[PDB]
Amino acid sequence: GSHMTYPKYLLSPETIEALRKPTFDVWLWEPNEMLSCLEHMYHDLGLVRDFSINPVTLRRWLFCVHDNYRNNPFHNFRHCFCVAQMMYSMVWLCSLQEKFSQTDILILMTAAICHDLDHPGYNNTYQINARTELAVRYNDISPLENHHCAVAFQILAEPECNIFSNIPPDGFKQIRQGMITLILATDMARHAEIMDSFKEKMENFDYSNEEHMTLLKMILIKCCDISNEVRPMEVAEPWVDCLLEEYFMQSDREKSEGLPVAPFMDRDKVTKATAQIGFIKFVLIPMFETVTKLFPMVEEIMLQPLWESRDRYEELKRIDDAMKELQK
Amino acid sequence: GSHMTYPKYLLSPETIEALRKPTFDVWLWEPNEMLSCLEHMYHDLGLVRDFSINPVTLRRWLFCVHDNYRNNPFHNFRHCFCVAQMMYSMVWLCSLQEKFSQTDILILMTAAICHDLDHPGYNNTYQINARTELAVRYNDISPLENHHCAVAFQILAEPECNIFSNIPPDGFKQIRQGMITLILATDMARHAEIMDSFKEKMENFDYSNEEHMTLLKMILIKCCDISNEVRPMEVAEPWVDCLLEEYFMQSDREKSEGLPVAPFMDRDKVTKATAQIGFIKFVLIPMFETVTKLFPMVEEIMLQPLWESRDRYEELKRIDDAMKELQK
Ligand SMILES: Nc1nc2c(ncn2[C@@H]2O[C@@H]3COP(=O)(O)O[C@H]3[C@H]2O)c(=O)[nH]1
Ligand SMILES: CC(C)Cn1c(=O)n(C)c(=O)c2nc[nH]c21
Ligand code: NA
Ligand code: NA
Ligand code: NA
Ligand code: NA
């Protein structure tokens, strides 16, 4: 492209373009570049325009969100960026601006950015079984997700970060409610429940029914959260090692502290391949299959990579197993 | 009775007998006497026996619970004592020991004691509208009740207060879950919902069905919580002035802060009579009417007092109105 060279935090035209697509390489970029991307999304989606978001607050706020993500192997700022960027992608892929109000898009995007704030890197089962302060604070009800959500609104309450400061109270209340529903909906304990409620509505789906649309937004955020395997293989694959890093940290600690261990986080019973095959076949494909009933373009862009990944992990397993047929 | 005088915190035989009935005068007693009452309940119901509760811990725990109630006009330690004492009365009145396990009795009683821990004296609507720390911590979801419950388990986690220290983890988990459900059930925003679910189960109630029993337990705690008017008039009436004292404190503060004022708390609009008539006819009677379907002894002991009070309060209003009219 360009006749001179610019700082990396000035995103190039090529990057801006690439950012609209689920093929975007989320590993290329350092945090301040990711922060620029998130900023751009808010401008590009018309959210700054339509909600009078002070552009410097938008930046202060993102910087502050960034500060409140922790350096976990998986549940970190980059993960949050994936989730937000996949939501961005979904807005274009599925022409969500035809279907949803700008308020709904604000909710989706802001929920996506905030959905894992201050995650400690051990899940709700650890919290509850260890009787941690969070588990006690929230009475064993989606403690992490309640916490993410609370931290979100603590941040937004600081005046210099309050991107909603020019939205009237009714709008604030509408956004707040939406975000709480959506962030809480990311608790995988509720996956089967949420999927069932959705499928029920899908029997006769209605874009002007608020309840249908809440459930769609819940499915949308859930899709984005667990979307890593939708991405190109070279981009998706590193995330699995991060996931297991975090799972193994937790399951080791559980063993050490006499707490119950989950077999799907058990160092002894788990490889990349076995982790991903079940998850792809039984969580991701089905979810995206139903989304596709509403948005057919999803099949080609997102079900296909999932099929390809499923098949590759199946191959890899064949060879992992062989490899342990030496040994043991 | 007795051949010598004993300290007030040694309950007399006559007190021990009277404690078992809903006629007990909750106003006669000082905190330490009320604590000795709660203590006796745990021994008398076999809970000290069946859960190996260390008797000194039972006392530390009750003292600590007492310290974490605030000195509000209504939501104070004495109210907590009423709710617990009414649950104790209900256990005998309804022969609940025939229907419920001791684990369930433990849940009902401990929930009853803890259900309003650290109440600030302003309701959930105030917390949500004023956007308080509790509202933000709990994302607008039954913040008070979540808080009471968190404080309950904060107390029980202090080893010197852990009356559950000799229960195995499976028991603990079972008790904790129950207590959370029951304390959360006390939020009156959920009244109509909970009542409807119960009425559904009542169409063919089944004491062996865990969901039926959760709902029953929920109803029982809700009964005891709002049970003031079930008591003898001279014991019931002073509580109305306390309730209004708290309500008026809230609406005054809302008026001052520019927040919305609920008419039922507006000192310009409310009287003892108007407060209680609607509440009796339309929340209390119906609730106890359905409990009577399972426990017909409840009619004579609790509906009758509620009818008497209703009629008394309608009559007070008829008089109030005759004054109002007589001036203007
Ligand atoms: N096996 C597997 N699990 C995943 C993947 N992505 C997300 N998850 C799981 O789904 C969960 C969604 O919510 P969390 O962020 O709590 O934690 C996530 C992981 O436990 C993946 O690629 N593979
Ligand atoms: C509107 C009503 C729920 C308010 N309310 C209440 O919650 N409790 C517990 C009472 O005793 C009561 N008495 C009058 N109004 C009351
Ligand atoms: Na999450
Ligand atoms: Na997540
Ligand atoms: Na309460
Ligand atoms: Na109460």
Chain B residues with CB-CB distance to A under 8 A?
131, 136-141, 146, 149-150, 153-154, 157, 176-177, 180, 184
- Mapped onto helix, strand or coil, the DSSP state of residue B29 is coil
Cα-to-centroid distance, B284 and ligand 6 (Å): 14
Calculate Rg over the CA atoms of chain B: 20
CB under 5 Å of ion ligand 6: residues: B 116, 225
Residue A115 marked in a binding site:
yes
Q: Which two tokens stand for residue A22?
A: 């689920």
Residues of A at the B interface (Cβ-Cβ below 8 Å)? Answer: 131, 136-141, 146, 149-150, 153-154, 157, 176-177, 180, 184
Burial B191-209 (b: 16+ CB within 10 A, else e): eeebbebbeebbeeeeeee
Q: Which of A131, A139, A150 sits opposite B139 (nearest CB)?
A: A150
HSE-CB at B233 with a 13 A cutoff on CA atoms is 9
* Token pair listed for A135: 């588990």
B74 Cβ contact partners less than 8 Å away, ≥ 6 residues apart:
B121, B239, B242, B243, B245, B246
The Cα B152–Cα B116 span in angstroms is 9
Q: What type of residue is B7?
A: P
Among the partner-chain residues B136, B138, B153, the one whose CB lies closest to the CB of A136 is: B153
The tokens 């193994």 sit on which residue? A248
H/E stretch holding B76 reads: none
- For ligand 1, is residue A188 a contact (CB within 6 Å)? yes
- How far apart CA B98 and CA A172 sit, in angstroms, is 51
Structure-token pair, residue B285: 């009677």
Residue A261's region, left for phi above 0, alpha for psi from -120 to 50, else beta, is beta
Pick the closest to residue B58 from B70, B74, B47 (CA basis): B47
Q: How far apart are CA B261 and CA B270, in angstroms?
A: 13
B294 secondary structure, DSSP code: H
- The tokens for B166 are 């000799």
* Coarse DSSP helix, strand, coil percentages of chain A, rounded to the nearest 5 percent: 70, 0, 30
Q: Which two tokens stand for residue B57?
A: 């811990």
Rounded to 5°, angle at Cα A199 from A198 and A205: 80
Cα(A295)–Cα(A23) distance, rounded to whole angstroms?
18
- Count of Cβ atoms closer than 10 Å to residue A102 Cβ: 14
Amino acid at B325: E
Distance between CA atoms of B63 and B59, rounded to whole angstroms? 6
The structure was resolved experimentally with X-ray
Backbone phi, psi, residue B304, to 5°: -60, -50
d(CA B146, CA B115): 10
Distance CA A14, CA A1 (A): 8
Tell me how close the Cα of B51 comes to any Cα of chain A, in angstroms. 20
Given the structure tokens 């608790």, which residue do they identify?
A187
Phi and psi angles of residue A119, each rounded to the nearest 5 degrees, phi first: -65, 130
- Cα(A83)–Cα(A114) distance, integer angstroms: 10
What distance in Å separates the CA atoms of residue A285 and residue A307, rounded to the nearest whole number?
8
Resolution (A): 2.5
Question: CA distances (Å), B144 to each of A212, B75, B77, B184, B195, in order?
Answer: 30, 12, 16, 9, 21
> Which residue in this structure is represented by tokens 């949420």?
A194
C-alpha to C-alpha distance for B132 and B140, rounded to whole angstroms: 10
Strands annotated E in chain B = none
Which residues neighbour B169 within 8 Å (Cβ) at sequence distance 6 or greater? none
Which of these, A155, A160, A151, lies nearest to A120 by C-alpha position? Answer: A151
The rounded distance, in Å, linking the Cα atoms of B231 and A5 is: 82
Q: How far apart are CA B202 and CA B157, in angstroms?
A: 37
Cα distance between residue B152 and residue B304, in whole Å: 34
Enclosing H/E stretch for A121: none
Alpha helices by DSSP H, B116-232: 124-129, 133-137, 143-157, 169-185, 191-202, 210-225
Q: How many other CB atoms are there within 10 angstroms of residue B102's CB atom?
A: 14
Question: Pseudo-torsion of CA B207, B208, B212, B213, nearest 10°?
Answer: 70
Q: How far apart are CA A160 and CA A54, in angstroms?
A: 10
Torsion of CA B39, B41, B46, B48, to 10 degrees: -20
Q: Which residues of B touch A139 (CB under 8 A)?
A: 146, 149-150, 153, 180, 184
Which two tokens mark B213? 């029993």
Q: Is A247 annotated as ligand-binding?
A: yes
Domains of chain B, earliest start first: 1-328 (1.10.1300.10)
Q: What is the DSSP string of B289-309?
A: HHHHHH-THHIIIIIHHHHHH
Residue bearing tokens 């099929």: A307
Give the closest residue to A100 by CA, choosing from A36, A40, A111, A60.
A111
Backbone angles phi, psi at A46, to 5 degrees: 85, 10
Question: What is the gyration radius of the CA atoms in chain A, in angstroms?
Answer: 20
Closest-CA residue to B319 (of B264, B278, B273): B273
| Ligand found nearest the CA of B79 | 6
Q: Which amino acid is at A239?
A: W
**Residue of A131, A157, A180 lying closest to B139 (CB–CB):** A180
